[PDB]
Amino acid sequence: LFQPPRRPGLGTVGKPIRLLANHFQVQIPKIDVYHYDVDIKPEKRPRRVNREVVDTMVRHFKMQIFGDRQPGYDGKRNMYTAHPLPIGRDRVDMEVTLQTFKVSVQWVSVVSLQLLLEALAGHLNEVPDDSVQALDVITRHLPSMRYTPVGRSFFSPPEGYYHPLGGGREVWFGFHQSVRPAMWNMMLNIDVSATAFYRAQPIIEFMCEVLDIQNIKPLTDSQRVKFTKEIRGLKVEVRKYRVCNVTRRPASHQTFPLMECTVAQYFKQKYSLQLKYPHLPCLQVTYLPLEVCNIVAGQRCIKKLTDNQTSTMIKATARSAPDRQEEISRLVKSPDPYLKEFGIVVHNEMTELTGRVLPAPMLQYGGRNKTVATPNQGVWDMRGKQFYAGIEIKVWAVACFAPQKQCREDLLKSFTDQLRKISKDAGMPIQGQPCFCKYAQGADSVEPMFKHLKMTYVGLQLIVVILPGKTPVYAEVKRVGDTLLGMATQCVQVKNVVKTSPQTLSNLCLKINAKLGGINNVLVPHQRPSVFQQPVIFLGADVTHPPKKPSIAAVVGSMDGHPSRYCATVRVQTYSQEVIQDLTNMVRELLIQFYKSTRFKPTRIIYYRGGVSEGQMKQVAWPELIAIRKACISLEEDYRPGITYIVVQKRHHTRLFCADKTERVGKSGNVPAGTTVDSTITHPSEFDFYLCSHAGIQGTSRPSHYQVLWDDNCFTADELQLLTYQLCHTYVRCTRSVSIPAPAYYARLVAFRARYHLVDKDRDPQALAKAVQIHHDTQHTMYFA
RNA sequence: AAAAAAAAAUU
């Protein structure tokens, strides 16, 4: 365990901007809360059941134990009261019926809310976790009884609204709620929310949606296989059951040992029911005919959404910032005996605060002249500018996997002609026509074609691949190119070939130049923070998880002092589940490539860590710090550069709004790029800040939250905020400030790519590891661009 | 995959 650094001070750089945040002040008195352990048997019942078990225990045992107490309870083992229960330190056993439960209640501790207030007043080092937890349980007791909790959110069925997603799924709306420490006062973070549920409906209706069926003959081959995969694991009601599988033969014929009896007869002997769909199968739970079953209401959709379900939901849930602002405000302003029990009061107005809009860097371009760009509202363009270091492309090939019918030769020639012209304008001149331009079909053609190209065209620098929409070909192109043969590839969808655009072509060149080792632009050097006065390396790290399938760890590192070029490392691995297991070897590799490229080891390591929750970040940071130092020692004994460890988070629900309407930007009306907050809603003592580095395009922007868990380098607040913002302008794929620093974003791209490498075109842990190994001809290139 | 942003316990 360790102490993260204190906030070194408040930032003062940038234009002041009046803001509102969806943090609502919580008034807490200087009182105890009394904490009791709750032991319910039978053991693991669903959390919602424990809540009603305890809720009914409280009411039935009123005169004997609870009296006028309104206890907070988390649905697990934690109960909180404003005054001690009449039971001393003794474990008291009770019994309650709904099934009969046995519940034990026992004093475990006094929790001090005054101690929490002392920490918020700066009088204390650490914010006490027991107090924050008590407050969370108390303030979320009522909505937990009234709504359907999902994580820290609460949802309600779509009463009187029709919001379909397809595949038997629907949108439920609700809100996120969390308690957060701030200076002086606790805050309640409230944000509107929405998520996907299975609609409560007849199984037969569900079956028709999933299985392509317009209207009402037994099922078929691959109908039933997909109908299963969508219904397996769901609760149905007729009492409730769980679906193991569906049956292969119809209810008319599906037997079970009773005699030997089949399903249809069984339900007219008892239920006196003539099946209207005896030709339909049964759900295995063990057999229930479809027409007797309904999906049970309130089941979260856990499976991944299709791409269009995802779209539908965003369009149903993405509102402009001022619209989101008004919805939050109205939600909060629209009785709570658990709050009253502890004299807790929640203010119904958003917190007002002042942030700063940081100045954006200037970017240096090159080629024909030392041209420059600086963003306006988070965006700039490459018009009339050439790359700082542009690659000359002399040998390149085109492979079109779209049908010639769909992408005629004159369409293809026009595409390559235009791409040549744009590339020359950008200072990455594609010299002459492709050495190879052919049509092909199917992923199976990729490997022999690329082998042939590598064999035949010495100096081949690039293969441009035209794809026919979503296809297995993409994953195979990257497998062969990145891992098998080490050949740079740039894919492009046929729709962007047959219907071209200069912006699209220009953006392609951004990626191609980076892939081939060019430098698109650099931060203007003398305007970087002072950290660049000595060799410094920037690392970005992330871990992606599957929804069996492996987790993937990615760490990227700058390879020059600009910083523009980055090298990647990636691993397959199986709170300690979040730690990057091979971090020492990965960081070692990146340090060595930096050393090789610049001829210096860095005196400082700046490490941006994505993919970790607030609750686990300290537990993750400590072993990762040890691992980074071990990597340093492996390059040279006693080599101890200063490390700054910064967690980047954007899955939180803090939202910032312009207090002054005239300062809203664009149709979405968001805060401007550069908007930074390091007071009022941030941590009372630790070193954290919000920075909305990007321009909001649609809906409400999510400002990234940065938490400094370690800092040998003693950054000032301004230096680190400015550094972080400038790194958001070095991302090669667009001339825009992006929402997280380039190295953190690359780490995600590297992890996503590894997923494609793991696809099996039609496994052992060492096999998984070799699958994501990049070929050496590309291992130190920006293949992930 | 031009790109960013944007939603998440009888049969």
Side-chain angles (χ1 to χ4, degrees):
Chain A
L1 224 75
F2 69 98
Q3 258 195 266
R6 307 295 88 180
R7 182 181 313 287
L10 290 170
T12 60
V13 172
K15 182 191 181 57
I17 180 166
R18 282 171 51 245
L19 296 173
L20 305 166
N22 61 347
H23 287 222
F24 298 83
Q25 194 194 63
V26 183
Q27 284 168 315
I28 306 297
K30 307 205 306 184
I31 61 174
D32 292 345
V33 306
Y34 300 100
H35 177 199
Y36 294 86
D37 178 75
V38 178
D39 189 85
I40 305 179
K41 289 169 154 346
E43 294 180 300
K44 178 169 117 27
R45 296 296 185 192
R47 199 161 170 179
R48 26 165 166 86
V49 170
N50 292 343
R51 288 191 197 274
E52 190 86 354
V53 163
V54 160
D55 184 81
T56 40
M57 173 198 60
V58 165
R59 169 168 342 103
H60 182 62
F61 289 87
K62 179 193 175 183
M63 297 297 170
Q64 172 172 335
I65 298 299
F66 292 99
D68 296 302
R69 232 65 47 186
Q70 293 276 20
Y73 171 59
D74 63 354
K76 298 182 266 189
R77 313 204 70 196
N78 305 107
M79 174 182 285
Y80 301 96
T81 63
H83 300 98
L85 302 173
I87 64 176
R89 286 170 190 326
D90 289 344
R91 181 188 338 205
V92 173
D93 300 327
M94 271 159 298
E95 183 179 276
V96 65
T97 75
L98 295 176
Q99 159 78 255
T100 285
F101 292 87
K102 140 64 195 155
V103 289
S104 299
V105 174
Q106 186 175 25
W107 198 92
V108 289
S109 62
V110 179
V111 172
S112 172
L113 298 184
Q114 173 176 351
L115 187 65
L116 175 57
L117 294 178
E118 300 279 5
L120 302 189
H123 297 169
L124 212 56
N125 44 330
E126 222 197 288
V127 172
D129 288 344
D130 61 340
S131 312
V132 172
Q133 182 188 340
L135 188 65
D136 187 51
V137 173
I138 288 161
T139 58
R140 78 190 315 118
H141 189 111
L142 187 59
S144 291
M145 298 293 292
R146 161 183 308 173
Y147 303 119
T148 301
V150 176
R152 292 165 157 189
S153 296
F154 299 97
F155 298 96
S156 291
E159 243 171 64
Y161 278 78
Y162 198 74
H163 297 293
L165 292 175
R169 297 153 195 204
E170 65 181 1
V171 184
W172 289 27
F173 293 88
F175 65 100
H176 162 97
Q177 167 178 318
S178 52
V179 292
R180 314 201 101 268
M183 198 80 199
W184 312 115
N185 290 98
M186 293 299 291
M187 295 284 181
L188 201 67
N189 175 218
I190 304 298
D191 192 13
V192 282
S193 194
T195 196
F197 276 74
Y198 289 99
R199 174 159 61 82
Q201 56 166 344
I203 286 302
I204 295 184
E205 193 190 342
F206 174 94
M207 179 195 51
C208 292
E209 304 195 17
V210 168
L211 289 194
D212 322 344
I213 295 157
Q214 73 210 16
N215 167 268
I216 60 105
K217 321 90 180 194
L219 291 182
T220 74
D221 266 30
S222 285
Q223 278 180 335
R224 141 156 184 78
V225 63
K226 189 89 177 259
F227 169 54
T228 47
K229 136 192 181 166
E230 296 298 333
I231 193 61
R232 170 145 22 196
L234 298 190
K235 316 259 204 184
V236 296
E237 57 182 35
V238 282
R239 141 160 170 78
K240 300 162 174 42
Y241 301 87
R242 182 160 253 106
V243 184
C244 326
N245 216 39
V246 194
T247 56
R248 275 245 249 172
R249 54 176 175 182
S252 59
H253 283 75
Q254 181 57 75
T255 65
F256 66 97
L258 172 143
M259 339 182 299
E260 155 144 338
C261 194
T262 78
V263 166
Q265 183 62 59
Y266 184 64
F267 294 96
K268 37 224 184 171
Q269 187 280 357
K270 312 178 163 183
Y271 295 51
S272 154
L273 177 63
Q274 288 224 90
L275 299 185
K276 156 109 197 146
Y277 301 97
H279 55 281
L280 289 189
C282 303
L283 298 183
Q284 189 184 0
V285 297
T286 34
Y287 304 121
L288 302 176
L290 302 186
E291 75 195 68
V292 172
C293 313
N294 296 340
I295 308 271
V296 173
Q299 301 175 71
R300 204 197 339 181
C301 187
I302 293 184
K303 293 186 176 66
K304 202 228 186 40
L305 300 194
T306 75
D307 285 281
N308 317 293
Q309 289 175 327
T310 310
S311 300
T312 305
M313 190 151 80
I314 294 179
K315 293 163 337 214
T317 60
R319 332 259 183 103
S320 69
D323 287 355
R324 175 178 296 262
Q325 186 187 338
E326 182 63 16
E327 288 179 42
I328 293 166
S329 298
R330 292 195 19 256
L331 170 67
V332 167
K333 281 183 176 178
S334 76
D336 189 333
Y338 300 98
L339 301 185
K340 243 125 203 177
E341 177 85 357
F342 298 86
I344 295 163
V345 174
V346 182
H347 276 173
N348 65 355
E349 316 251 66
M350 287 191 33
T351 296
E352 306 176 79
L353 68 80
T354 297
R356 293 161 292 116
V357 188
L358 300 174
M362 177 157 305
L363 294 318
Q364 175 74 66
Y365 283 88
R368 192 174 33 235
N369 269 306
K370 306 212 327 166
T371 58
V372 299
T374 195
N376 173 56
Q377 307 282 33
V379 178
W380 66 99
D381 57 64
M382 265 199 86
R383 194 202 331 198
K385 297 179 272 287
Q386 302 187 318
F387 295 131
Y388 180 89
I391 303 301
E392 184 188 359
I393 301 174
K394 321 193 84 180
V395 189
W396 63 298
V398 182
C400 183
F401 278 87
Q404 143 168 348
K405 321 63 171 179
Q406 184 185 6
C407 186
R408 183 57 60 87
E409 294 89 0
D410 67 320
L411 290 175
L412 242 186
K413 183 59 156 64
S414 192
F415 171 78
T416 57
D417 285 333
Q418 293 172 35
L419 181 63
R420 284 164 68 186
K421 173 221 154 44
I422 299 303
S423 73
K424 241 189 64 169
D425 287 342
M428 186 197 76
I430 294 168
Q431 317 282 34
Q433 296 175 10
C435 63
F436 174 106
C437 181
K438 299 192 180 306
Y439 293 101
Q441 304 165 35
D444 291 351
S445 275
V446 168
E447 178 170 343
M449 183 200 283
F450 286 14
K451 278 203 235 293
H452 166 255
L453 292 179
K454 187 179 181 180
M455 259 287 302
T456 306
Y457 302 102
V458 66
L460 181 57
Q461 298 167 263
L462 178 71
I463 307 175
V464 174
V465 187
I466 302 158
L467 303 177
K470 171 178 248 192
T471 167
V473 173
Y474 176 81
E476 184 70 353
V477 158
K478 295 306 177 175
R479 186 188 70 86
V480 176
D482 298 339
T483 78
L484 188 54
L485 302 176
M487 304 173 73
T489 59
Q490 181 57 61
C491 301
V492 54
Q493 285 203 2
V494 60
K495 69 181 181 181
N496 298 315
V497 167
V498 300
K499 184 179 178 181
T500 69
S501 145
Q503 177 78 284
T504 291
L505 299 181
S506 177
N507 279 345
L508 277 161
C509 290
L510 301 185
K511 290 152 61 71
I512 293 164
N513 199 57
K515 287 176 180 175
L516 299 187
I519 299 164
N520 288 7
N521 67 49
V522 305
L523 295 175
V524 164
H526 67 272
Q527 300 178 348
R528 303 172 293 179
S530 55
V531 77
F532 288 89
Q533 285 162 8
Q534 303 158 37
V536 50
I537 188 172
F538 302 91
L539 306 178
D542 210 325
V543 179
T544 64
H545 301 288
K548 307 178 50 166
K549 233 139 179 141
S551 288
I552 295 166
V555 184
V556 303
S558 54
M559 288 312 140
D560 61 46
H562 298 304
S564 300
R565 292 215 95 239
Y566 282 79
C567 281
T569 61
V570 70
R571 298 286 192 278
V572 160
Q573 57 187 41
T574 289
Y575 90 91
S576 47
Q577 337 170 19
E578 306 298 329
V579 175
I580 295 179
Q581 285 160 26
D582 205 15
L583 190 57
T584 291
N585 285 336
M586 297 165 84
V587 168
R588 171 189 163 83
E589 180 173 339
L590 296 172
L591 288 172
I592 289 173
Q593 281 302 307
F594 181 98
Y595 188 19
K596 182 75 175 76
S597 164
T598 73
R599 311 296 197 83
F600 293 98
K601 296 191 293 288
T603 67
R604 304 184 170 95
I605 299 173
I606 316 304
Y607 181 88
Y608 286 95
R609 182 58 153 94
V612 302
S613 70
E614 281 215 22
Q616 308 204 328
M617 59 180 177
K618 292 180 180 63
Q619 294 89 323
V620 167
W622 184 249
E624 287 197 351
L625 279 166
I626 293 175
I628 290 165
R629 293 184 200 113
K630 282 181 192 172
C632 296
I633 301 299
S634 82
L635 273 76
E636 176 176 307
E637 187 77 357
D638 296 325
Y639 164 58
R640 301 184 210 101
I643 303 169
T644 301
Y645 191 116
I646 309 156
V647 166
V648 190
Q649 288 149 342
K650 61 177 288 165
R651 299 203 60 134
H652 62 77
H653 280 273
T654 291
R655 306 275 186 163
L656 301 172
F657 307 96
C658 300
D660 180 351
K661 250 170 29 162
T662 74
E663 294 183 318
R664 298 169 173 170
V665 179
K667 327 162 267 287
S668 63
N670 281 288
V671 298
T675 297
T676 305
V677 169
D678 65 346
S679 62
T680 310
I681 62 169
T682 47
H683 197 274
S685 59
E686 296 172 0
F687 189 180
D688 72 322
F689 59 94
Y690 297 91
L691 162 64
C692 185
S693 51
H694 62 286
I697 288 164
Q698 63 177 244
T700 305
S701 299
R702 308 178 91 104
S704 295
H705 189 212
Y706 298 86
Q707 313 224 29
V708 186
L709 302 186
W710 194 262
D711 185 22
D712 294 319
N713 299 308
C714 299
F715 279 97
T716 62
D718 284 317
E719 283 170 339
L720 192 48
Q721 287 160 15
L722 288 167
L723 177 60
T724 299
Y725 192 38
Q726 295 200 359
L727 293 170
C728 295
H729 295 72
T730 64
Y731 182 75
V732 294
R733 278 152 59 114
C734 55
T735 57
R736 311 173 63 86
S737 185
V738 294
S739 58
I740 57 174
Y745 211 135
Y746 294 149
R748 297 185 56 78
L749 298 180
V750 166
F752 298 157
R753 179 59 53 81
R755 286 283 171 215
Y756 285 111
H757 294 159
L758 286 166
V759 170
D760 297 295
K761 180 203 42 164
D762 77 37
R763 247 188 316 193
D764 170 273
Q766 139 176 59
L768 289 186
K770 148 180 223 195
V772 304
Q773 271 180 2
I774 313 301
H775 189 275
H776 119 58
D777 285 351
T778 45
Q779 72 183 329
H780 296 319
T781 75
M782 297 189 69
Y783 65 87
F784 49 85

